[PDB]
Amino acid sequence: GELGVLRVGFTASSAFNSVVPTAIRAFRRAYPDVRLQLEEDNTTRLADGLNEGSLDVAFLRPGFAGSERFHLRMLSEEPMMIVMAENHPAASYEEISLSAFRDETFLLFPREIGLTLYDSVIESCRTAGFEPTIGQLAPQIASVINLVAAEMGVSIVPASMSQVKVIGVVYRHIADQTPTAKLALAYRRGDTSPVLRNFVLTVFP
Amino acid sequence: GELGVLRVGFTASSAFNSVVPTAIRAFRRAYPDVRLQLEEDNTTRLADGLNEGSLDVAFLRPGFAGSERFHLRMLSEEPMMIVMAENHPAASYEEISLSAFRDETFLLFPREIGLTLYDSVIESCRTAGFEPTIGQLAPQIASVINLVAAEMGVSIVPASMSQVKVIGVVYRHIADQTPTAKLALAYRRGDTSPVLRNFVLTVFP
Ligand SMILES: C=C(CC(=O)O)C(=O)O
Ligand SMILES: C=C(CC(=O)O)C(=O)O
């Protein structure tokens, strides 16, 4: 499996986690004659792509319905952080608890694209003792961060999204809970393709 | 047109330009009873969405084939910048000329999603006197930046993408040419909807 093409998907936020570019670069160097066709889409779409054979492997968020039909190998777990406007009152706090936002508007992406990550944001607020008020939905976490800059609310994001230094936003660690965003390598059961095997073994030497 | 829904599209990179969140927030405050349905997609898809009626207005890049069928109002022009790995030899230069990359690999997004921006990157290199070697394609400019962090090549991006401070990349202004990335508000000709009118007049008071 030194020649051919591999269709590799990942979520938009997952690309900001170092494991994704690290794996892509490592595979390209070890197997230069395998063309990587890269697709950026959310976990719901990536799982469907794996199921229908339009993707060969994906960096996605584990836990979705039917995930037991695929192989899932954990690649990164990272804390979740609050993103807020620089002038938000909580930005002056020495320690940030989620209860400070019990009456704040949360911006999010539409649940249907990534149920597990969306639900983990809601449950984080529930663990802090409140039902969050969800305001404007935006398509991706980067889109949400840009609306946070316009003071439309706050959000909770994978820690690696703190690289997205939109002017006028700040990222803070959460004093509660330690909610975590998870990234796994996903691929079909009983797909014995040697190219896929070479990719999986590159990601997990 | 104080009630209803407006379907608003924008490209993933365009959200990092302040005009997009500024306009969305201003409209939401002036017309709270109009629901904004936000879609993030590239200029090719946004133009098709406007044509088929699945979008009402878009922040897109002007110049595409058939653009004369729509209204296009310029909203922002910004310089384009080089994004490269922090350890690239040109990162030490006092002034950055595109000819320094004449033998470097350029990473880009697939041309079909945004012909005008893609072609402006190629022509920038041509104006500098070389045909660029295009390496790995990634789906969006943010995806490309993350691969630049893995030292897979360099790219040219709208200046506002310099907010995307992926660890291990740097952004530099270009000594040549002044290549510019353009953002326009696009909507259908002869669409007399009062909600759309209210949005357009919010963006251009
Ligand atoms: C918005 C999401 C959630 C998902 O696709 O699982 C992401 O960027 O990872
Ligand atoms: C990749 C592009 C080009 C386009 O969609 O016109 C962008 O993010 O703006």
**Residues whose CB is less than 8 angstroms from the CB of residue B185 and which lie 6 or more positions away in sequence, other chains included:** B23, B57, B58, B59, B71, B72, B73, B75, B200, B203, B204
Q: B47 and B184 in contact (C-beta within 8 Å)?
A: no
The Cα–Cα gap between A187 and B85 comes to 31
Q: DSSP string spanning chain A?
A: --SEEEEEEE-TGGGGSTHHHHHHHHHHHH-TTEEEEEEE--HHHHHHHHHHTS-SEEEE-S--TTGGGEEEEEEEEEEEEEEEETTSGGGG-SS--GGGGTTSEEEE--GGG-HHHHHHHHHHHHHTT-PPEEEEE-SSHHHHHHHHHTTS-BEEEEGGGGGB--TTEEEEE-SSS--EEEEEEEEETT---HHHHHHHHHH--
Search chain B and give the residue with CA nearest A143: B15
CA of A46: how far to CAs of A42, A53, A197, B107, B138, in Å?
6, 10, 19, 23, 16
Search chain B and give the residue with CA nearest A26: B150
Instruction: Find the B17 Cα to ligand 2 centroid distance in Å.
Output: 12
The Cα–Cα gap between A69 and A194 comes to 20
Search chain A and give the residue with CA nearest B16: A146
Least CB-CB distance to B137: which of A25, A38, A149?
A38
Instruction: Find the B115 Cα to ligand 2 centroid distance in Å.
Output: 8
The Cα–Cα gap between B55 and B75 comes to 18
By what method was this entry solved?
X-ray
**Domain boundaries, given as residue ranges, for chain A:** 1-78+183-205, 79-182
Give exposure, B72-95, as e/b (b: 16+ Cβ within 10 Å).
beebbebebbbbbbeebebeeeee
**Closest listed residue to residue B77, CA positions, set B158, B188, B190:** B158
Q: Taking CB atoms and an 8 Å cutoff, what residues of chain A touch B153?
A: none
Question: Which residue in this structure is represented by tokens 């008071």?
Answer: B205
Distance from CA of A22 to the nearest CA of B (A): 6
The Cα–Cα gap between B185 and B76 comes to 10
Instruction: Find the A74 Cα to ligand 1 centroid distance in Å.
Output: 15
Q: Do A24 and B136 touch (CB under 8 A)?
A: yes
The Cα–Cα gap between A126 and A176 comes to 11
Classify residue B129 by burial, with Cβ atoms within 10 Å: 0-12, 13-18, 19+.
Answer: exposed
Q: Taking CB atoms and an 8 Å cutoff, what residues of chain A touch B107?
A: none
Residues A110, A141, A203, A63, Cα dihedral to 10°: -30
Is any atom of ligand 2 closer than 6 Å to the C-beta of B156?
no
Is any atom of ligand 2 closer than 6 Å to the C-beta of B114?
yes
Q: Do A163 and B163 touch (CB under 8 A)?
A: no
Q: Do B143 and A38 touch (CB under 8 A)?
A: yes
What resolution, expressed in A, was reported for this entry?
1.5
Q: Do B143 and A40 touch (CB under 8 A)?
A: yes
The Cα–Cα gap between A86 and A84 comes to 6
Q: Do B15 and A149 touch (CB under 8 A)?
A: no
Q: Taking CB atoms and an 8 Å cutoff, what residues of chain B touch A113?
A: none
**Residues whose CB is less than 8 angstroms from the CB of residue A116 and which lie 6 or more positions away in sequence, other chains included:** A43, A61, A62, A63, A64, A182
Q: Do A151 and B38 touch (CB under 8 A)?
A: no
- Residues lining ligand 1, judged by CB closer than 6 Å? A 11-14, 42-43, 61, 109, 113-114, 117, 140-141
* Ligand 2 atom having least distance to the Cα of B42: 5
Q: Which residues, in sequence order, are bridge partners of residue A70?
A: A188
Least CB-CB distance to B143: which of A15, A22, A28?
A15
